[PDB]
Amino acid sequence: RESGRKVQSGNINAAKTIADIIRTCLGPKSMMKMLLDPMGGIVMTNDGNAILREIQVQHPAAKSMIEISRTQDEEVGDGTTSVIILAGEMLSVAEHFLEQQMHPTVVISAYRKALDDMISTLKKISIPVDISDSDMMLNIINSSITTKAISRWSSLACNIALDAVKMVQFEENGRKEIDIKKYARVEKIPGGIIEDSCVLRGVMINKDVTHPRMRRYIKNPRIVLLDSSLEYKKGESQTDIEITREEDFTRILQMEEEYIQQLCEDIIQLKPDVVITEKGISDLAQHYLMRANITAIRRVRKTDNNRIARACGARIVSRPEELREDDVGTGAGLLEIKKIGDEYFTFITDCKDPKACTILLRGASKEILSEVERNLQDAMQVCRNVLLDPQLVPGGGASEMAVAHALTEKSKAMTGVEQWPYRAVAQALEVIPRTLIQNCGASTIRLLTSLRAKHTQENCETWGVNGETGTLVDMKELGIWEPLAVKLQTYKTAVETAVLLLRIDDIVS
Amino acid sequence: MLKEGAKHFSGLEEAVYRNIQACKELAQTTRTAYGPNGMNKMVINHLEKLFVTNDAATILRELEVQHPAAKMIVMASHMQEQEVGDGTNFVLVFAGALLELAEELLRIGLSVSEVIEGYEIACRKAHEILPNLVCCSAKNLRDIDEVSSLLRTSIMSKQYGNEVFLAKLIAQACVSIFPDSGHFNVDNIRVCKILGSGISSSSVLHGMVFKKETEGDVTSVKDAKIAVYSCPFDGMITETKGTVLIKTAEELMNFSKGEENLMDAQVKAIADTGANVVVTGGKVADMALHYANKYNIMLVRLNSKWDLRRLCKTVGATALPRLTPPVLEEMGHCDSVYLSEVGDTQVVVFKHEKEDGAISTIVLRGSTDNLMDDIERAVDDGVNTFKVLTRDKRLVPGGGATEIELAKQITSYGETCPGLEQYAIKKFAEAFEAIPRALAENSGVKANEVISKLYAVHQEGNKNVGLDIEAEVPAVKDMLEAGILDTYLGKYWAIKLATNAAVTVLRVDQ
Amino acid sequence: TDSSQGIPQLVSNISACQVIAEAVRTTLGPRGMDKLIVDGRGKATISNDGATILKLLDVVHPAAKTLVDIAKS
Amino acid sequence: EVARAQAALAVNISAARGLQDVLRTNLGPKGTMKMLVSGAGDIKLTKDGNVLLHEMQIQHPTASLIAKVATAQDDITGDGTTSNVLIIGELLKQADLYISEGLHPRIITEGFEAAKEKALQFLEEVKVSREMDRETLIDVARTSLRTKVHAELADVLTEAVVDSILAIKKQDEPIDLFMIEIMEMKHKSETDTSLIRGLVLDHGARHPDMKKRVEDAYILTCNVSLEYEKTEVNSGFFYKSAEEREKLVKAERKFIEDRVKKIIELKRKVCGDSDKGFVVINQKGIDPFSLDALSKEGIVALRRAKRRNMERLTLACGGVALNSFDDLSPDCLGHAGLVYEYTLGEEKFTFIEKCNNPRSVTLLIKGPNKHTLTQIKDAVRDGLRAVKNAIDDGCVVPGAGAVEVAMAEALIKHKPSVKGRAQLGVQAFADALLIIPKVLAQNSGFDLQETLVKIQAEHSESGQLVGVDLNTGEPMVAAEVGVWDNYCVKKQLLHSCTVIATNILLVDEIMRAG
């Protein structure tokens, strides 16, 4: 039985002490968190998702901090370190001045109006980026690969990642909102080397098909996706027992191949040389196709065959008795199975429903593959937010101090009770401008002062704090940039958490 | 320690003090363990059995320590004992007081490496002047008196009271027969206690002495092939079974008839294969016995674990229990098989003589085994003292008279050099001094009365202490010119191995 | 492995050997103040001499065991 | 449990003090020996910067990370792991004072970086391209062994060290994966150590003098059973059916005489005479009545061979494993030029040298079979890993403090990054360099202040790389003493120190988790 301010302050003390070490983990210059296991194990990370899952939390508000980090992780995966930083000082600064005065609902609606004023200010500060220029996309990826500070061959993986996500931009909800990255697929290769690879059309497959079971190479013939009914007929048109007897062998087998050859004649109408079958696939059905001069494929998961259907832009047929070129294998299509290393890798290019290209990476080992991949994993996060919003916001304290001022004149204009949470959120925005001064090592009281002074003149349009040089730098000149969409949802999550724990005054069993 | 890490058992106090303090306490019982002794050490064991002894190698194996500095040095005392005989009493007591002097240099502020290299220069220079302190040699190892002259010091290092009769008797039991030109038995010298016929009636019996009573008649020939078996013969008794006390006694009679004809053929097949003596590590069967008398084959009623393994070594046999009719895979070696009554006990005597392949075994007769198993400890290092592997053993002054002969040289050598190694050479001459200081405190006088004289006599080689009045008041005892000798080699390793141990244990701080 | 040395070890052996000599001091005489000896046996045992009583003692001092073994000899 | 603002940094630096303090006297010939009985509860004699970390039951998380970090250094260098421990706590000492004055750790970490690459710039300046001649290889091998063991033991071992690495230059290999087999001889003195070009077989063929001198060795490294175990089964082990188990017995004795007759056809197949020898190395014991019959045919047949020897004899000499002795040509077998049965101890130790391919060189040490034999085992191991770096680089440098003050002169006096934020980290960086020459000489008796003022003047006077004599306490020139470090070694200790210093400096919470 828990109630009152003590739940509220316990919500404060838990959410604050989480964000303390993790804001030192912020910045490309950061401070690693140390985690001593009781077995003596050591964790030295900055990424809060590995942090929050490893640490032991006893307050369910601290468990809810993981849940809003699970919220940001499942939508993006990045900024999960940053969503918990902003949510601390929202409830740290405003609450105890006002919950000694005890108005929960007013601070909720103050948290409402802190959100939309930030939204318009995002459109004030963000100039649009080119979604038709690689170099406009390049420097923002270069801002992301230097976070882990890996540019061995991640720099050439910048162009591989942008030529995947910009290509796979196709996603509808009635107004074509595209925030997809699952339509892209990386190639996980132990052989070859990264640099003489490039993006290929369609959606490339590495997950199950690693063998030339399709053909060796295909120029003209189409791909066939089969979720249709390929279960053979045991009786005349009946489902009797299967072959387990010589008496069951002679009668039934004549009608077993009879169901299959009708399907095979329907498929040869579009002239393939490759047919993959997933649902209803039988052992006899995929080897009369061997007699029908088509090498047939099974044992593939469904998410492969969503990619393979997007590798050709065709609809997977549920009609068994008629197949067309306008049903499976849209257009001519291309299928290329070549040797990279020792294994023969299936590429499916020439995607009709065009603009579909995926990632081809190949390390000299799997470890050499995996290190470049994580940088390209962060890179495909960024371009997906570029597809989500084609405007770029300056990094550092340029975005934060600009919004931190606009709440103040909003607080002077509205000048109700909500004016006091605005200035509190205005200071809650500055903690990432605060923590970069420890992420560099400079005097924090002077740099926050001069960043206010640059808002007086320059309005902090592109002059924010750098935790790399400790000075208030042009984000145009230094190339520290990020999309508006990743900035908004990071702030949107921190608004959601601050409203959440403000409702929490009782924790009972 | 400031942190959760760093598990260690040594440090600033513990390495300086407690490592040396642990080596002090092990050397504390060895203050009177070499040379003349009034000191005795009762031990109850891990076997929890009452024994008194004066050999530290018996004591230190009963002793356990967690201090690795204290643990390491007793292995080096074994390394001298593996090489030469007695003097394993000396290795601990020399290095023990050596390290106590090293604390005093660490009291002053000397670096440990200055103390490390200081005794090393002193170890080399002493080993140079030490063969110049060779005063005699075993010119005739066939002589009984020249052999007994060496042995009186090592027996004194167990007990002063039995040094003279045993040193003759060991030479009477002939370690003299070895030319020592690569000839030394290590297990065909194995001392055989015969209970009864008290300790001055201890005797001589060359070749392998077996206390076990000779059963049956004597061998057909003394040139017999020796069959050494682990348990060929058995003896029957049983108790209640799974269903109690089995349903008949007919199969008990049926099993008893084949048992006699089994051991009838076992003595027969040994008689057929050429062996005319059987060695039974198990007990004797009655049905086996009365066919062995007609076959004229000598039998041993029982043997222990040590009896078979010496026979598998010396004769060259293989020990296995014969549940089959035995054949000869044992190749009898000894050409003379005797029965003797030693201590009025039927004693199996095997015998052969070769130039560098002879056998000559110590036998002891005493009315108490618990006395005689410590008397053999005076014999154990004394026989290995003959293993210098040379005829002329380069005999040095016995008793410890070489120590004051050395200590005059070393502190003179320590004065001439410069350095901070300079002091540890002078402390090294003090390490010779501590042993006769500890022995004279068992003699019955103070050390400063004694040690003043042995420095004041001169380079002499003769002047030392025993356990007499001449040891006490004048501190002059002819421990060179009265049948008291030591060899060069036992003195050479015991200084060497005590040095390398003490230098090793001084560097460690963990 | 335990050990005790020196004079405080040695005097401890002496007074241990005194107490068993305090017992038998006039047992060759017919007289004294009797001890019937009951052990985990649970049985009544008297004697007229000390040597039978010395066969009954499980000595706890090994130095005092030596004086037993000479006297038993 | 959590560790807050001051305490989380403080436990890390205070543990780095006493870790550096206990591991002080472990580098160079002033470096004293250490024992562990608290790592495994056994009498252990151990010396290395990495190996002492791995044995001690440490619970502080920093020393656990350094045991991981110095492992990457120990894979290349060996010694130098104890060099890395000394400079870390000294580097943490100066920067903590600035934090004790009140300063961000990150601005000092920012000053740790540009200070490092100037020293890395200085390493190309101070590297001395010497030849890889044997006497130049001796001076590296002298200071490597005298770090761990005595100098009298070192110089006997240094003779055996520098010749095997010249043999790996015949294979043109800069590194050492083979010729590193440490074989141990039963002795009582570890004063002796023999070098065999080929291999050392550790056994002696129960009926001796079969063929103890083989000038033409055709090697068969097999494991054929001649003492074959004979079992009667009906269940995979002993069963109750006495009727069934009897019929298998008649074929069990036919296997032993089968393998005896196969040896006779192989000797006439390979040799054809007794002038050319033939050697059988059996991993198992051989029948002595076979060892009598094989000895007359011109065959020596070694038995109970070690399974570790089984692969290495195939690599250098040759000879593959069978369970038969079928007719084989000398192409299927390997060759050795000379076979000699040597005896020391209770076992015969057959020397086998001048292989079909002298690819592996056996380092045979003698010793009293103690931890001293173990202590000379890893000492020559780190002796080989140090001169492994010598074949790697072209520049062998006078070390022992000669570079250390030479860096700190350029770092303090010349600001590389004259902006004051980074020069703060330079001051902690250059003062970190002083710890190796100053305290080992101070341990030798001439204290740290007399040593520093001498070597700073003399190197600024000469430019000749004056080091420090660790046996007097005063600086002497390491070019003539022969206390040298490689260009490969000195970079990594600069590399491994800095990266592990910055991350533990940049923590603020050490939380119990999992």
DSSP string, D181-217: EEEEEE-S-TT-EEEESSEEE----SS--SSSEESSE
Whether B210 has a binding-site annotation, put simply, is: no
Please, which residues have CB within 8 angstroms of residue D166's CB and are 6 or more apart in sequence?
D134, D137
Q: Are B495 and B91 in contact (CB under 8 A)?
A: no
Chains touching chain D through at least 3 C-beta pairs below 8 angstroms are: A, B
CA B466 to chain centre: 23
| Contact in structure between B63 and B22 (CB atoms under 8 Å) | no
The answer to whether B14 and D29 are in contact (CB under 8 A) is: no
Report the candidate in A99, A95, A92 with the shortest Cα–Cα distance to residue A16: A92
Separation of first and last alpha carbons in chain B: 12
| Token code pair at residue C15 | 């007074």
**How is residue A340 written in tokens?**
């990279």
Subunit contact D35:B10, Cβ cutoff 8 A: yes
What tokens were used for B223? 């040139």
Tell me which residue in A24, A29, A56 faces D513 most closely, judged by beta carbons. A56
- D398/D140 Cα distance (integer angstroms): 10
Residue with tokens 């499976």: A328
What does residue B350 show for φ and ψ, rounded to 5 degrees? -100, 150
Give dist(CA B43, CA B29) in Å, integer: 12
Q: Which two tokens stand for residue A381?
A: 């996060």
CA B478 – CA A311 distance, rounded (Å): 109
The Cα D353–Cα D337 span in angstroms is: 6
D105-126 and A431-440 are packed helices; what angle lies between their axes, rounded to 10 degrees? 30
User: Do residues B427 and B118 make contact, with C-beta atoms less than 8 angstroms apart?
Assistant: yes
Residue D20 corresponds to which tokens in the numbers above? Answer: 């550096």
Burial status of residue A505 (CB atoms within 10 A of its CB: 0-12, 13-18, 19 or more)? middle
Residues in chain C: 73
Chain A interface mutation, best of D506, D507, D510, highest count of A Cβ atoms under 10 Å? D506
Helices B19-28 and B88-108 cross at an angle (nearest 10°) of: 140
User: Which structural technique was applied?
Assistant: cryo-EM
Question: Could you say which DSSP state residue D249 is in?
Answer: G
Start-to-end C-alpha separation, chain C: 30
Q: Which helix (H) or strand (E) holds D301?
A: strand D299-302
Q: Which residues of A are annotated as a binding site for ADP?
A: 27, 79-82, 147-148, 396, 467-468, 482, 487
C-alpha closest to that of A470 among A445, A497, A501, A436:
A436
For D189, the closest chain B residue by CA position comes to B79
Backbone angles phi, psi at D311, to 5 degrees: -85, -40
What are the E-state strand segments in A305-355? 334-340, 343-349
**How far D5 CA lies from chain A's nearest CA (Å)?**
10
Q: Which residues of B touch D42 (CB under 8 A)?
A: none
Whole-angstrom CA distances from A142 to A48, A78, A380, A482 are 22, 16, 12, 10
* Tokens, residue A71: 């919220």
Tokens of B94: 């020399």
**Number of residues assigned to chain D:** 514
Task: Give the tokens for residue B204.
Answer: 């001589």
Are B166 and B382 a contacting pair, CB within 8 Å?
yes
**Dihedral sign (CA D286, D292, D293, D296):** positive
The annotation status of B158 as a binding-site residue, yes or no, is yes
The first and second tokens of residue B246, run together, are: 């089995």
Yes or no: say if D271 and D278 are a contact pair by the CB < 8 Å rule: yes
Chain A closest-CA separation from residue D361 CA (Å):
33
Here the tokens at position D226 are 């001649």
D31/D34 Cα distance (integer angstroms): 9
**What does the buried/exposed string (b/e) look like for D239-271 if buried means 16 or more CB atoms within 10 Å of the residue's CB?**
eeeeeeeeeeeeeeeeeeeebbebbeebbeebb
Hey, what are A431's tokens? 């903690």
β-pair partners for D25: none
Phi/psi for A459 (5° steps) reads 60, 20
Q: For the CA atoms of chain D, what is the radius of gyration?
A: 29
First to last CA, chain D: 12
Query: Alpha helix (H) ranges present in D239-370?
Result: 242-245, 256-270, 288-297, 307-315
B72-103 in b/e burial notation, b at 16+ Cβ within 10 A? bbbbbbbbbbebbbbbbbbbbbbbbbbbbbbe
Burial code (b: 16+ CB inside 10 Å, e: under 16) for B439-455 equals bbebbebebeebbebbe
Written as one letter, the residue type at A313 is G
Chains touching C, CB cut-off 8 Å, 3+ pairs: B
Neighbours of A182 (CB within 10 A): 11
Q: How many residues comprise chain B?
A: 510
Interface of B with C (CB under 8 A): 25, 28-29, 42, 44, 50, 62-65
| A31/D507 touch (CB, cutoff 8 Å), yes or no | yes
**D425 in contact with A, Cβ within 8 Å:** no
Beta-bridge mates of residue A349: A334
Q: Whole-angstrom Cα distance, residue A134 to residue B125?
A: 83
Give the separation between CA A379 and CA D126, rounded to whole angstroms.
Answer: 42
Q: What are the backbone dihedrals phi and psi of residue B395, each rounded to the nearest 5 degrees, phi first?
A: -70, 130
Place of tokens 């440098």: D397
Q: How far is D81 from chain B (nearest CA, A)?
A: 17
**Bridge pairing between strands A334-340 and A217-218:** antiparallel
Distance CA B379, CA B362 (A): 9
d(CA D331, CA D388): 34
Separation between Cα atoms, residue A443 and residue A446, nearest integer Å:
6
CB pairs under 8 A between A and D: 82
CA dist., res. A398 & res. A122, Å (int): 11
Q: Which residues of A are catalytic?
A: 47, 80-81, 378
Among the partner residues D108, D510, D514, nearest to A34 by beta-carbon distance: D510
Give the type of residue at A223: I
Sheet order of strands, D193-196 included: D181-186, D362-367, D193-196
Residues of D in contact with A54 (CB under 8 A): 513-514
CA distance A442 to chain D (A): 7
Chain A contact for D64, CB < 8 A?
yes
Residue B195 has what DSSP assignment? E
Measured at the CA of A430, the angle between CA A424 and CA A434, to 5 degrees, comes to 130
- The tokens describing A187, both together, are 């190639």
Which amino acid belongs to residue D112? Answer: F
CA D149, distance to chain mean position in Å, is 14
Distances (CA, A) of D250 to D229, D231, D244, D257, D340: 14, 11, 13, 13, 41
CA atoms within 13 A on the CB side of A8: 20
Interface of B with D in 97-156 (CB under 8 A): 111-114
Contact D188 B75 (CB under 8 A): no
Distance in angstroms (rounded) separating the CA atoms of residues B60 and B67: 13
Q: Are D120 and D437 in contact (CB under 8 A)?
A: no
* Distance between CA atoms of residues A40 and A34, nearest Å: 11
DSSP 8-state secondary structure symbol assigned to residue B485: E
Structure tokens at B195: 């209970």
Pair of tokens at residue A503: 């409702």
Give the sign of the dihedral formed by CA D68, CA D71, CA D73, CA D78: positive
Q: Could you tell me which residues come within 8 angstroms of residue B261 by beta carbon, excluding any fewer than 6 positions away?
A: none
Query: CB of B389 within 8 A of CB of B180?
Result: yes
d(CA A134, CA A123): 23
What is the secondary structure of D339-391 as a DSSP string?
EEEEE-SSSEEEEEEEESS----EEEEEE-SSHHHHHHHHHHHHHHHHHHHHH
Active-site residue set of D: 48, 81-82, 382
Q: Is B354:B178 a contact under the CB 8 Å cutoff?
A: no
Test A40 with D513 for CB contact under 8 angstroms: no
Angle at B350 between CA B347 and CA B351, to 5 degrees: 135
b/e sequence A30-66, b meaning 16+ C-beta within 10 Å: bbbbbbbeeeeeebebbebbebbebbeeebebbebbb
Radius of gyration for chain A, computed over Cα atoms and rounded to the nearest angstrom:
29
Which chain C residues are closer than 8 Å to B64 by Cβ? 1
Contact criterion met (CB < 8 Å) for B2 and D444: no
CA-to-CA separations, D329 to B51, B106, D85, D267, D333, in angstroms, rounded: 67, 70, 57, 10, 7
Q: Provide DSSP, B96-136.
A: HHHHHHHHHHHHHT--HHHHHHHHHHHHHHHHHHGGGG--B
Q: How many residues does chain A have?
A: 509
Residue for token pair 């002819």: B478
| Rounded-to-integer distance, Cα A108 and Cα A110, Å | 5
Identify whether the C-beta of residue D13 lies closer than 8 Å to the C-beta of residue D20: no
Answer yes or no: are the C-beta atoms of D210 and D291 closer than 8 Å.
yes
